[PDB]
């Protein structure tokens, strides 16, 4: 199917110390594969997945240099932004950048991303045409004009269309049996007696990958949306995910209600109920 590479970068100011903390995490298909943390004793991009382990020292030094330069770039931009927003001295401030590429199921570039948040709020984003910028506010307009002048979008487009795609291809092959594989949800229902004449059908999806999933509860045939409790899809820690969906039900009416699980790994949607 389709695939994606994302680098998520964060620089955070804090009252007190000369230089802010810079972190970069790389994901192939929303599975962590590299990390850089300026706090670590020996700051460097490190492998966060076994298949990435077979890149050589030159790979690691070149990517590290990019992180070190990014650190400098975020440091300067943090200060530039202080002035743009007429923020005084100190405060805690944050700058986020997301970037990368989506491929289709044919492995060709579907969409490129290059975008920034200041203080958790959209600042500037490279448009989908990969040539023009959307600027969230007047401050961002300054940046936009600046980057229009320097032709920075051309730089970004070249990375997005070229390097990003070309190396995502290399990673998809190298870690073949992890990224291009799916793990389907193991599904089951636990039962929890409640107040008067009310039990609680919780329906579990465990151990799936990727993270996108959907759970519904049905009675007689009409999907139940209200009355129902959902939890946010959560990492199990081992590369997989969990979710559950629960509902209110009277005693006796267990074999009426049915949970459905919708996941890419399934040959088809999944149906189930309480099993005494």
């Amino acid at each position: 199917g389709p695939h994606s590479m994302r680098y998520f970068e964060t620089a955070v100011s804090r009252p007190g110390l000369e230089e802010p903390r810079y972190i970069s995490v790389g994901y192939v298909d929303n599975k962590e594969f590299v990390r850089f943390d300026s706090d670590a004793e020996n700051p460097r991009y490190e492998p966060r997945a076994p298949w990435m382990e077979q890149e050589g020292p030159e790979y690691w030094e070149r990517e590290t240099q990019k992180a070190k330069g990014q650190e400098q770039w975020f440091r300067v931009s943090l200060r530039n932004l202080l002035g743009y927003y007429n923020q005084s001295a100190g405060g805690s401030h944050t700058l986020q950048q997301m970037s990368g590429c989506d491929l289709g199921s044919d492995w060709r570039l579907l969409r490129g991303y290059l975008q920034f948040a200041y203080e958790g709020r959209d600042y500037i984003a490279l448009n989908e045409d990969l040539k023009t910028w959307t600027a969230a506010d007047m401050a961002a307009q300054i940046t936009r004009r600046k980057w229009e002048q320097s032709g920075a979008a051309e730089h970004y487009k070249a990375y997005l269309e070229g390097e990003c795609v070309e190396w995502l291809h290399r990673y998809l092959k190298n870690g073949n049996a992890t990224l291009l594989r799916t793990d389907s949800p193991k599904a089951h229902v636990t039962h929890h007696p409640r107040s008067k004449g009310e039990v609680t059908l919780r329906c579990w999806a465990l151990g799936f990958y990727p993270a996108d999933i959907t759970l519904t509860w049905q009675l007689n045939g009409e999907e139940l949306t209200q009355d129902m409790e959902l939890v946010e899809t959560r990492p199990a820690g081992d590369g997989t995910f969990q979710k559950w969906a629960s509902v209110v039900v009277p005693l006796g009416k267990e074999q009426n209600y049915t949970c459905r699980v919708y996941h890419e790994g399934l040959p088809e949607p999944l149906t189930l109920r309480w099993e005494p």
């Binding site: 805690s92 401030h93 944050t94 958790g120 990492p235 199990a236 820690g237 081992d238 969990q242």
Partner: peptide, 25 residues
């Protein structure tokens, strides 16, 4: 929440997943 279905006396991993906060500190 636990990585694996919980049984007493059986090695498991306990998770605390924290989301939606800002700033990241």
């Amino acid at each position: 929440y636990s990585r694996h279905p919980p049984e007493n006396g059986k090695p498991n991993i306990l998770n605390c997943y924290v989301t939606q906060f800002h700033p990241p500190h």
